[PDB]
Point group: C3
Chain length 332, copies 3
């Protein structure tokens, strides 16, 4: 028996008063689908003759192992965005412009403008502190081999007249010179000095100098003749003094050299030697001595003779004479 089932197009079914008997098959001609009547329900309400429940499907895809927008969105949210952040490269890029503690080269300038915790007294302060007590090198090497410059190598300046610290303080202990300035015979000489001092302060010596030499001078000066011409330097001196007036001045009465022992001293106050042998000096009591014949354009006020090698005085002479003339005058 070739059995054929009630049938019409889906849309036609979709509007049939036709109640399929229970378990009677009806057929959707334009789709080929079928449905079994429940004895009591319009065709468009019967379900299919076979399941359509995803659960019952063979060859299910693993949907479970697939990532979900949300899951993937949170997992992304923990991770940093390309620009919010610097490539290892831009990091170096910037880093290499910064000086390191271990050392570097400043092509630019290093201004310092200190806040001053305590300003740290005595050698654990100063904007630059340099402790070399465990190192064999220099503290601050500053040099130039330029031909001309517009400024000096180191300059110190204080602008307020109340300022009360030194510009340079040198507290030195060691076996060589505390401070050494050496100028080298130029090919080109100059008219300036190695150390030049200028003080406007009428209330304080431009340079003050104290020492406690056993066998040496507090200030020692040596003039080397710059040439081999013994007669070359006829005009150099070991020490030159000029007492002078204020530009636009009446004059000056300031003294030349002024020596003194406030404390008192047995030494020669002025001792002058040549070829390491005394030639003139002033004894501490103010007597003077000279190896060689002298001259006074002028007169010598002095005490009458007593010794034979004492100079005569008009008085002594006259009196010697006055005596002879008179004593002679057995011519009574």
């Amino acid at each position: 028996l070739r059995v054929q089932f009630k049938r019409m197009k889906a849309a036609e079914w979709a509007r049939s008063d036709v109640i399929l008997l229970e378990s009677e098959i009806g057929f959707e001609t334009d789709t080929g689908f079928a449905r079994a009547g429940d004895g009591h329900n319009r065709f468009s309400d019967l379900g299919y003759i076979s399941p359509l429940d995803y659960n019952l499907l063979t060859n299910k895809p693993n949907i479970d192992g697939l990532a979900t927008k949300v899951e993937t969105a949170q997992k992304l949210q923990q991770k940093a965005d390309k620009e919010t952040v610097y490539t290892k490269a831009e990091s170096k890029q910037e880093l290499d412009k910064k000086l390191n503690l271990k050392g570097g080269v400043m092509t630019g300038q290093l201004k310092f403008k200190p806040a001053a915790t305590v300003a740290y007294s005595s050698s654990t302060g100063g904007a630059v502190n340099i402790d070399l007590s465990s190192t064999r090198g220099a503290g601050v090497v500053v040099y130039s081999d330029n031909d001309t410059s517009d400024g000096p190598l180191m300059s110190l300046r204080t602008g307020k007249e109340t300022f009360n610290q030194s510009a340079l303080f040198v507290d030195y202990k060691g076996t060589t010179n505390a401070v050494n300035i050496a100028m080298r015979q130029p090919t080109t000489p100059n008219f300036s000095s190695a150390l030049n001092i200028t003080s406007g302060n009428e209330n304080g010596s431009a340079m003050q100098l104290r020492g406690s030499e056993k066998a040496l001078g507090t200030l020692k000066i040596t003039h080397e003749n710059p040439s081999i011409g013994a007669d070359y330097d006829k005009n150099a001196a070991a020490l030159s003094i000029d007492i002078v007036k204020k530009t636009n001045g009446a004059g000056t009465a300031a003294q030349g050299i002024y020596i003194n022992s406030t404390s008192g001293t047995t030494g020669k106050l002025l001792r002058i030697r040549n070829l390491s042998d005394d030639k003139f000096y002033v004894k501490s009591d103010g007597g003077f001595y000279a190896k060689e014949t002298s001259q006074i354009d002028g007169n010598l006020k002095l005490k009458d003779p007593t010794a034979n090698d004492h100079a005569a005085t008009k008085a002594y002479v006259d009196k010697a004479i006055s005596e002879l003339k008179k004593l002679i005058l057995k011519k009574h």
Copy 2:
């Protein structure tokens, strides 16, 4: 023919001894599903009258293009986590606190504590090396316009008596002064000096000074009168010396000024002029000269006369007399 098929609830089927003939339809009344008998298999083992194989489904979703947890987990694992890493901002945030080689402003302090490779002799060492041979600016500018300070602008100090380098070494070549200290007439003057030196070392001159001037003094001093009062500075001197004792001392015998030519010299050893004209001097042989009448509170030991303008000596006089008295005595 309205055909209806064997039928009972699924659960009822699920336990029927009823073997459906091959290709005979049976019907699950509570689900509407059907199944075809294979002539030999309990109903609950027949499959459906139509496929449920995901593969055969129309409107398949692209499951293939969906990301998978694993895939998405590895791809995430290559990407960096928000905090493990610094925002471009925190990067600057930190970076801007670091001094750069091109220059910056140190609001804080810069201690140096050197390790010392070699400690680098002669001008490619020192913790601070400053080469300005190609620049027209200063080396180290240090100034203050504060009114008071607790420390100096630069200080150098060495604490060990064996220390064997200078505190400041100045090797200078150029056309101006190697070192220049200038003090400016204060509104407020002080009692200190421009350059003050103090040495405790009894074995070395506090300041030693050598030069080879052709036509100039090794040490040159000029005293300017600070006022226009010619009689103002009655008490200044070009150079003042005080020879003095140790606080708590017997005395001192240390000399005042001590001059010498160890090598020997034809020059005036002491030459004193006024208005650029000789007034007193000591000849290199130790003869002295004076333009103006002099005085000795005291006596003058000297050699008998020879010239007419030589001073007389008690002896010479007496003998001249002794002669006349005697020669007169044609009074036989």
Copy 3:
């Protein structure tokens, strides 16, 4: 009626000339599937007796909420890769090696090699600028408590003879000494000085010094005896001069001390005192005075007497005599 349907294996169906009548069921015996004839289409072209359209499935999975490779790939592309970027740690790791503006410790060296915008005149230049006008601390503290060192604490050097700036310039205003060097009595003394100057320049005083003291010397020297032995320092001097020759020299003619008032001065040019009381001096007109008896190994050229306390001259004496002898000669 047990109805059974046309049937053969799928593969057998798959090649049947058998046209199923419309809505007549045929059965795939090896699969259990069925199909309804459309009256006109070979069996292998009929579809199933029930849908296989993913859309119509109950228990649909949310495919919509699943992430897609592309979506997930772009969202990943915005996020940075682990190594392209530095962990907050490596960031510090590097950062901590860089000196900060607020302060740090340079274990290494800081060379400076300046480019020079303008080289900045007068106190807003120098590779190191240090302004302490608002701080109470030091400018540049450099010290060492090492025993020996190979270099100094600060050194300045200029290599070109045309160089035209100072090495150290000190423009000072304040109430204490501009520059202070102090050496402390060593346990170990040395033979060097506190300040040593050496100039090769025959065209410029090694040290030049100017000041305008009202009541003080431009250069003040004090020699303290280092011991309490009054007779200890028999050989120290306040100032020692040596005029000397060029190593390999004929001699020198350079003078010892050279004093002058170019401007002219009423002061004593040379005044020597002991226990703060004049003992010898040279009057500005070049007359000299001495408190104590003197001596000249030699002769004294001088002007005839006028006063009684003037020294006699051979001439004066002789003439006094020549007169008496002659005047006596009432012996006619």
